[PDB]
Amino acid sequence: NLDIIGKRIEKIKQEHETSWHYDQDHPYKTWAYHGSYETKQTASSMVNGVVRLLTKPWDIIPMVTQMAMTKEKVDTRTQEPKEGTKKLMKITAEWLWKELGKKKTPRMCTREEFTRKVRSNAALGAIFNKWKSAREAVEDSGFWELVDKERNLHLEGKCETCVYNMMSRAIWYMWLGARFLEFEALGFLNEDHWFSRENSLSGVEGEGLHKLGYILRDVSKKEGGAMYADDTAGWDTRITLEDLKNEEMVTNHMEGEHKKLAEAIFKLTYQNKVVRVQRPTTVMDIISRRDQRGSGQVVTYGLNTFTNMEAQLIRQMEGEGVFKSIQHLTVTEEIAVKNWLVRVGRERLSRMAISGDDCVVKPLDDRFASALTALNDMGKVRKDIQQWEPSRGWNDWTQVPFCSHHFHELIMKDGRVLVVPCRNQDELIGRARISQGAGWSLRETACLGKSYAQMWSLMYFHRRDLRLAANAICSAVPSHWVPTSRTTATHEWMTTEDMLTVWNRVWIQENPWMEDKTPVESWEEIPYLGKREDQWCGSLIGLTSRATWAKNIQTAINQVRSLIGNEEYTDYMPSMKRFRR
Numbered sequence: 001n002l003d004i005i006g007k008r009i010e011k012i013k014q015e016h017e018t019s020w021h022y023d024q025d026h027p028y029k030t031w032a033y034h035g036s037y038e039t040k041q042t043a044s045s046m047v048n049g050v051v052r053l054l055t056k057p058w059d060i061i062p063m064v065t066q067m068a069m070t071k072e073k074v075d076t077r078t079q080e081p082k083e084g085t086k087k088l089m090k091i092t093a094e095w096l097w098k099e100l101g102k103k104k105t106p107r108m109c110t111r112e113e114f115t116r117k118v119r120s121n122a123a124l125g126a127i128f129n130k131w132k133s134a135r136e137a138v139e140d141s142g143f144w145e146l147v148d149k150e151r152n153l154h155l156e157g158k159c160e161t162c163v164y165n166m167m168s169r170a171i172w173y174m175w176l177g178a179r180f181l182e183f184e185a186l187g188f189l190n191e192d193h194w195f196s197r198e199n200s201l202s203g204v205e206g207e208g209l210h211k212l213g214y215i216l217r218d219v220s221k222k223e224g225g226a227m228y229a230d231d232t233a234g235w236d237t238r239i240t241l242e243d244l245k246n247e248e249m250v251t252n253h254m255e256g257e258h259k260k261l262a263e264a265i266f267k268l269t270y271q272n273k274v275v276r277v278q279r280p281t282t283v284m285d286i287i288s289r290r291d292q293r294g295s296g297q298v299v300t301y302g303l304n305t306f307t308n309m310e311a312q313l314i315r316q317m318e319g320e321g322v323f324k325s326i327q328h329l330t331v332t333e334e335i336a337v338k339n340w341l342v343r344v345g346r347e348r349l350s351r352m353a354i355s356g357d358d359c360v361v362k363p364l365d366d367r368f369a370s371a372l373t374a375l376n377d378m379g380k381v382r383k384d385i386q387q388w389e390p391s392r393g394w395n396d397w398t399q400v401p402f403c404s405h406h407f408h409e410l411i412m413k414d415g416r417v418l419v420v421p422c423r424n425q426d427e428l429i430g431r432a433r434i435s436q437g438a439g440w441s442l443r444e445t446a447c448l449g450k451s452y453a454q455m456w457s458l459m460y461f462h463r464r465d466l467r468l469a470a471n472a473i474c475s476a477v478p479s480h481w482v483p484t485s486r487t488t489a490t491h492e493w494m495t496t497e498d499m500l501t502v503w504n505r506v507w508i509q510e511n512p513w514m515e516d517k518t519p520v521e522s523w524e525e526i527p528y529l530g531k532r533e534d535q536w537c538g539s540l541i542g543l544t545s546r547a548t549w550a551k552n553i554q555t556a557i558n559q560v561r562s563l564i565g566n567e568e569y570t571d572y573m574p575s576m577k578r579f580r581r
């Protein structure tokens with residue numbers, strides 16, 4: 001408690017020693033409240049005019065238009081689990097780290113790795129303040145003094161400047177220096193692909209939307225019961241102290257300066273948070289707590305994946321009756337769990353596809369559906385079902401939801417079999433029509449649109465409206481202008497190369513589920529979903545407004561060409577059969 005956080009709080013108390021007050025109408029019961037000073041400020045989503053002008057039929061679809069417009073679960077507290085649960089979680093975490101580290105070496109990430117990261121404009125979610133942008137503070141050795149200072153503080157076992165700014169979400173920013181030190185200690189989890197499928201068997205980190213469908217299908221091929229895919233209710237707010245402690249056991253695989261630094265992040269930022277919060281009543285409240293998730297977007301992913309793999313293995317143990325009760329674990333129930341992990345624990349990881357808080361499990365049989373005592377006690381309460389009502393399974397990998405997607409089996413006119421990702425096309429068009437940020441040029445706007453268009457052509461080519469609208473946007477943006485993206489899966493659509501050539505690389509060449517690597521010569525070799533499948537997943541094919549739009553597409557393309565100016569443009573519409581004269 002208050003020794004570990006006191007320093008961070010005293011430094012802020014003094015930064016605003018003109019303001020300090022212990023207010024009596026503070027709405028925090030779960031969050032420890034320490035005081036407040038004075039402030040006054042707020043990020044609304046803007047519309048991409050290039051994408052909107054080339055998707056006109058969707059101007060009257062509320063599912064699309066509504067997306068463009070527009071904290072009582074973060075004030076909850078999960079009961080510390082039963083003892084038998086704590087034992088199960090501790091034993092499984094131990095085994096899992098060993099498994100994940102069998103062919104990886106934990107290592108410190110570098111200034112030079114973090115420097116290049118912010119320059120190529122990755123999202124690390126920091127605050128703007130001594131410097132301007134993310135890019136400014138990196139080029140300057142007086143910054144890395146402020147970093148150097150903190151780093152030595154962490155080795156000394158204290159912490160001064162590592163404070164969360166708050167603003168089923170609510171993202172926790174940290175000043176860049178704080179994000180560096182996190183990244184230095186734990187960046188290896190992402191950067192060295194600890195949660196690749198090759199390395200973790202359950203994981204899909206860096207597999208890409210074009211491989212996930214194939215991965216669910218290979219899980220389907222295993223003998224067993226239904227595919228379960230239960231979402232947890234507000235998973236970040238359900239991360240117990242015991243989860244943070246079991247996550248910390250990765251430091252047991254570390255050494256030297258690294259081991260101390262990783263230990264510092266876990267003990268001082270994760271297991272003892274300090275957070276500054278705007279309360280429009282506007283002030284800045286300074287609250288603490290020992291539990292819940294609050295890392296950076298990217299480390300959160302890897303740790304969520306870890307704890308999720310752990311819970312689902314344990315839910316599988318309960319379904320297979322490896323243990324009976326969670327109130328306390330016997331010493332034979334210990335050796336039985338242990339014997340299980342050793343004998344079948346790798347086989348059981350390969351029955352799962354886990355991506356942070358999200359999972360699909362094909363358990364050994366359907367007893368799994370009513371194995372709820374361990375899961376509920378770990379605090380990983382399922383969403384939109386009664387706490388003790390059995391999970392409902394899926395009989396068909398092409399119905400399982402995973403990473404906001406479903407997957408179709410699509411058979412090429414030459415018999416080869418693509419497995420393609422999909423979701424409600426209103427979702428895909430509403431997202432493409434949004435440009436997060438202030439002060440975009442017509443050219444930067446146009447280049448974002450082209451990123452979406454190039455993705456549609458790569459991932460969602462089997463949807464008729466998305467192929468046509470992608471050809472239209474790429475016809476309407478200068479052929480040579482480069483795709484952009486302000487918070488960068490595997491993004492092979494981020495290139496100026498011929499898209500049919502990328503398609504052959506991604507779907508034929510680099511695809512391990514394709515045994516015949518015969519290139520595809522033109523876009524008409526590449527099949528669509530069935531017309532009715534396309535309509536089920538939101539297609540406007542058959543509607544009057546869409547038939548007009550398609551017939552008169554070269555007129556919308558020209559409107560955009562005229563707003564941008566006289567530049568060098570390619571016509572891509574002859575790539576489709578109907579427009580090919």
Ligand SMILES: CC(=O)NCC1(O)CCCC1
Pocket residue numbers: 229230231382383384385390391392393394
């Ligand atoms: C949709 C489905 O097949 N099963 C999910 C639940 O288990 C049942 C309702 C919420 C969780």
Ligand SMILES: [Zn+2]
Pocket residue numbers: 150154158159160161162
């Ligand atoms: Zn610190």
Ligand SMILES: [Zn+2]
Pocket residue numbers: 406408422423537
């Ligand atoms: Zn679909």
